[PDB]
Every structure is written in C-alpha cells, then in structure tokens.
Amino acid sequence: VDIAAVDETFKRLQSHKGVLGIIVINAEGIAIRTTFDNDLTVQYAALVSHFTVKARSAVRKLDGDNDLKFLRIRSKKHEIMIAPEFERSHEYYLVVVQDPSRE
Amino acid sequence: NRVDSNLGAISSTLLVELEGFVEQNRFQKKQAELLAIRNEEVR
Amino acid sequence: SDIESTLTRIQGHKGVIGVIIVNNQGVPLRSTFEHDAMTKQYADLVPGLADLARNLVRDLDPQNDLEFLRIRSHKHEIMVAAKDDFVLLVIQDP
Amino acid sequence: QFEDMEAFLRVAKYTLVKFTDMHVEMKEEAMDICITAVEKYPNDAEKCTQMIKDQMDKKFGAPWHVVVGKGFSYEITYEVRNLLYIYVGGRTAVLLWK
Amino acid sequence: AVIKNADMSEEMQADAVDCATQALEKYNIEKDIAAYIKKEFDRKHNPTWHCIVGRNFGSYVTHETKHFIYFYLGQVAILLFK
Amino acid sequence: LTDEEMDMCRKAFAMFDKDGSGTIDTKELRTALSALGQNPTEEDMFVMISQVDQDGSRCIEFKEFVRVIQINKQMSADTLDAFVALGGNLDKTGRILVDKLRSICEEFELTVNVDRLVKDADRDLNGFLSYDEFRALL
Amino acid sequence: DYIRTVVQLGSSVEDLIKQNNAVDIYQEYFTNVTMDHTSEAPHVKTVTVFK
C-alpha cells in the first residue's frame, strides 16, 4: 500500500544528516502528517502558509509566465526548506527543517 | 615625537574650562605658560 | 578596490542577469541593467519578502535571526541577502 | 547572555508595562489583578478575561475590553487615561482598554 | 471564508468578508491589516469599531446588538465590533 | 527623538535623583535649586511638580523628564547660528552696515586686519551682502 | 493524488538536502581566531632631551 511508500519517504528524507523535521501542510494551513509536537506544528503551518502565498504572488506578479517550485529560508540554526507544487485538487507545500551542524 | 607630539597636543588643549568667571582668567593664565613652554622646545 | 571587483566578477558568470543593492526604505543604488523599468520592480517587491521571512524565522525562538534567502522559480533563482543596512539581490538562472 | 528559551524563562518573571496611561493606584491595582489572573489560569485564557473585565465592570467602568494572548495585533479607539499594555511571564501579553 | 461566531445582519456580513479579504490579499504585515479593516469600514457605516488580527489570542469584550464578528481565514484570525 | 539627547537626559536625570530613588522627590529637587541659589516656598514647588507629575506619583521620572525636555526643546540646527551671525540682526533685509563690522573688529582688539573680505565677498557688487551670498561667505 | 504529490516532492527535496550536505556554502573561514603573530622589534624613542 502506498501509505507505506509515503512513510518510507519520511524515513528516506529523515535518514539524512541533520534533518530535524519533516511536515506536510495543505492550502488551508492545517498540518496532515507531523514530526513535531502540536504547537510548533500549528505555528509552522500558519506562518509558512502565509509566507509562501505572499512569495508566490510576488513571483507571479514579477513575471507572468514564471512560477516557483522551491523555497529556502536560512537561519543561523536551521535552514527551513519549503517546496510547494501549486496545482488544482492538490497543492501541498511540504516543509523540511534541517541543518548540517548536528551529529 | 619632539616636533609632533608637541604640535598635536598644543593643538589639543582647551583654554576656557567649566563674576566668578575671573577664575577662568586665572585658569587662562596657567595653560598660557603651557603653550609657551611647549613652543620653546619645538623652537 | 574590492567591492567593485567582486561586482564585476559576479556579473560575468554563466547565468547572472542582474545584481541590485537597495537601501532600507528603497532607493536602488548601484543596479546593473541597461534600462530601469524593472529595477524598481525588484526594489519594491523583494524586501517585503525578506523582512516577512525574518518575521517567520525569528518568531519561533527569538535568539534566532535570518541571514539569506533563495527563491527558485522555473527560470530564475532570486537570491536575497537581507540584513540591517540594506537588501541585496542577485538574479540567476542555472 | 543566556543560551536558550529556558534560562530566559528563568529570568523573565517580571511584569514590565509596555505602555500605559493610568494613575499610579490605577496602575498597581490593574497590574496586580492581571498577574493574579494569568497565574490563576495559564491553560484556558478565556475565563482569565472573564475575571479581569467583570471585576473592572462592577468596580471601575461600565464599558471595558480585555485581550490576552500569545501573538497578535490590534488597532483600537480608546478614551484617554484608561489604557494598559503589559508583558506577563516573558511571553503572554495583555491589552486592556475602556 | 470561515466564521465561528457572529450576531449581525448578513447583508453587511458580506461587507465584512469582502472588506477583510482584499485587505489580507493586499498588505504584507498584520498591523496595517487591523488598520484597514477598521478604517475602511469606519468610513462606510458607523463611527466606532475595534478590530484584532493575529493567532492564539484571548479576549472578553462587551458585545453590540448587531455588531460583533469573529472571522477565520487561513489560520489567521480577525475580530471586529462596535 | 535623537540618540545623544538620551545620553544627556540620562546624565541629568542622574544629577537630579542623586540618592538613587529612581523617582524625583521634592527634596532632591530643592537640593538642585539650592545649589543654583534658589530657595522658593513649599507651595509653588508643589504646583510645579503637579503640572509635571502625570502619574499621580508626586514624583517625576525619566518618561516625564524627557516629556518636558521634548516639549520645551522641539516646540521652541544650523539656520539660527549662521542666520543670527550678523544678518539675523537685520531680519530679512539683506543690507548689513559696515559700521557693525568695524565695531566688531574694534572691540576684540585684533592686531592686523584689512576688511578686503567684504570687498571680495561682494556678490551683488554694490557694497553689501544679502543672506544667500552671506552663507556663501561662511 | 495526494500520495503521488508527496512522493514527487520527497524526491525533489531529497536532492536538495543532498545539495546542502555536499559542501557547506555558508561557512566563513577564520570566523574567530584571536591568536595573532606580529612584529615586535625594539623601539627607542627620545621623548625629550633634558637640556
């Protein structure tokens, strides 16, 4: 069953070095799978939802025929990675948090 | 030093300090000798 | 003569189409473009994204800050180095 | 120079008033009743605001308005000499206007 | 749009939702959101409003008979009243 | 509003509340006035504090300190000093008397001076200086 | 459709995470090195000659 495939993708990603977290959030800002506790989850979901719709509106405004498949914000602690796939019937901006300092 | 530790401290002084302002007069006696003294060595 | 040499190196690689420096509020100073109908576009669209992202990062744990940011579109890689004085932009398709 | 959230919460027990237009006795009574509200119910904050403005409702003014929270924004129109904005516990913050 | 609690005429509930959504679309900070949502509705209908925008806030407030609105958009929350 | 005014405000607030109370009480204020020579009543100082005390404390603090410095300063940078140099004694007339400059060079007893400056700062080429060409002199 | 999207994004991000572990870009050499080896030859200065 493909549920084993997506959970396997979580261990594929999460087996990498330093990867603190993986989470999936849909267009209505509600997380679906987690890896964190519940409140760091909901504050990521709200913040990243608003930020990525602003960034996509920025890129679409800047050029009409160009969209984004990628987003990468930096800390001094952890490099949040956002990926979105803007489509109909699905738009699931998955977001990873990682850093190469650990381990 | 002898020709430019003087002449970059002679231009570093502050004559007037912080009626009774006659003390300033007395104060401006003192540093006068200062510049005179310094000038002599450069001369 | 180090800042301008780095500008001249960085503007002559295989994909770079524009380097921009913009101040706190605005005033894009030292662009690199043969016309200026789209510099102002960058200068008034992008630092909203830079400080909005500093809000997103810093909100979590206030010892934290933001340093850089990348947005990779289909045909562009908008890299912004935001900090306190200014916002800096480099545009490049890989 | 503490090095986590937790040592910050060890230090941050003060209740700094961010901005306020209140009399000194006004300020001390309102400040202490809000700290007692926040210590009384950390979990459910709705009934903290229950207690704060219903005490201020019976005693001080017929209209009152309390907002407690974690992260928010606001723009209100308020009659002067009756505004309290304080930071409680180093995290939770409370706006209070008539 | 999501509404959790309101007691007011729906014909200006539509006014509230169309006032808030274009505001949220336009600006990119959340103080000016609570600025605009009051300001433009203030020049529309009445002299007095109050409006809160954020996440995880608590409040007790005296209602108004036909002016009390508690929005919800995209894990961003709005309150406004008279 | 600026950043060094906060420095001088902190130093002067240190000077007034000299014991360390964190609040200006009446006795330290009278100590400051008595160091300046004044020993007024114990009813006018009450009214003075009551106008400056906003919080009802009977003791004024740093916010009130800078409030009074703010109102008195910015209510009433380089315009005034260069302006009132000599032309601001003339108040938007652009004609400065030569006799004022002769008096200035008279009183300060200066050893050697020729007034060719006013001869060679003459930009209207009449024998006087308007204010814009006066700044051009400065 | 949700499953297909998630595995598509997992593939792309997996490439990205490798990209960040490959060589670290954001790392200034000698961020904080205090020990400096310098020039310390003897200096003779005549402050004044007392004559």
Side-chain angles (χ1 to χ4, degrees), chain A residues 51 54 58 62, chain C residues 20-28 39-55 66 69 71 78-89, chain E residues 28-29:
Chain A
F51 171 79
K54 277 316 181 186
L62 193 171
Chain C
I20 296 90
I21 317 182
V22 297
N23 261 349
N24 194 336
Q25 56 272 358
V27 298
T39 291
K40 191 53 182 175
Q41 200 73 264
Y42 281 166
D44 64 358
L45 283 167
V46 186
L49 282 198
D51 63 358
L52 192 55
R54 187 170 257 140
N55 196 45
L66 184 141
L69 191 151
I71 303 141
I78 319 181
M79 54 198 96
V80 57
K83 68 165 187 258
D84 279 277
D85 207 333
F86 62 82
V87 159
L88 198 150
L89 269 296
Chain E
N28 55 293
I29 199 165

Side-chain angles (χ1 to χ4, degrees), chain D residues 20-24, chain F residues 54-57 63:
Chain D
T20 294
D21 189 358
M22 281 214 177
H23 312 335
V24 162
Chain F
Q54 168 63 237
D55 55 358
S57 61
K63 188 163 89 181

Side-chain angles (χ1 to χ4, degrees), chain E:
Chain E
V2 183
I3 304 302
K4 295 167 189 164
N5 192 354
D7 46 354
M8 60 75 82
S9 70
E10 301 56 59
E11 287 80 1
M12 70 182 179
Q13 183 50 108
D15 291 331
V17 298
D18 286 332
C19 182
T21 179
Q22 195 301 340
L24 183 63
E25 182 295 334
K26 197 249 187 173
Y27 303 106
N28 55 293
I29 199 165
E30 70 276 16
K31 35 177 66 158
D32 190 359
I33 284 300
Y36 185 105
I37 297 169
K38 193 192 290 156
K39 263 171 188 161
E40 204 265 355
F41 192 27
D42 210 353
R43 312 168 331 150
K44 267 173 55 154
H45 280 199
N46 288 344
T48 305
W49 305 105
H50 311 79
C51 182
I52 313 174
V53 159
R55 56 168 176 85
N56 263 352
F57 50 75
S59 299
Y60 204 48
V61 170
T62 181
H63 79 82
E64 277 75 19
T65 52
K66 277 305 181 184
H67 297 89
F68 189 81
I69 298 169
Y70 175 50
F71 268 56
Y72 189 76
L73 293 174
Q75 308 268 24
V76 159
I78 304 179
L79 192 151
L80 81 173
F81 68 103
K82 197 152 171 48

Side-chain angles (χ1 to χ4, degrees), chain A residues 66-67 69 72 75-76, chain C residues 63-64 70 72-74:
Chain A
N66 194 357
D67 189 77
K69 55 93 182 183
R72 179 201 295 193
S75 178
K76 55 202 172 93
Chain C
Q63 280 95 60
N64 201 5
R70 311 194 178 196
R72 272 261 290 158
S73 64
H74 276 187

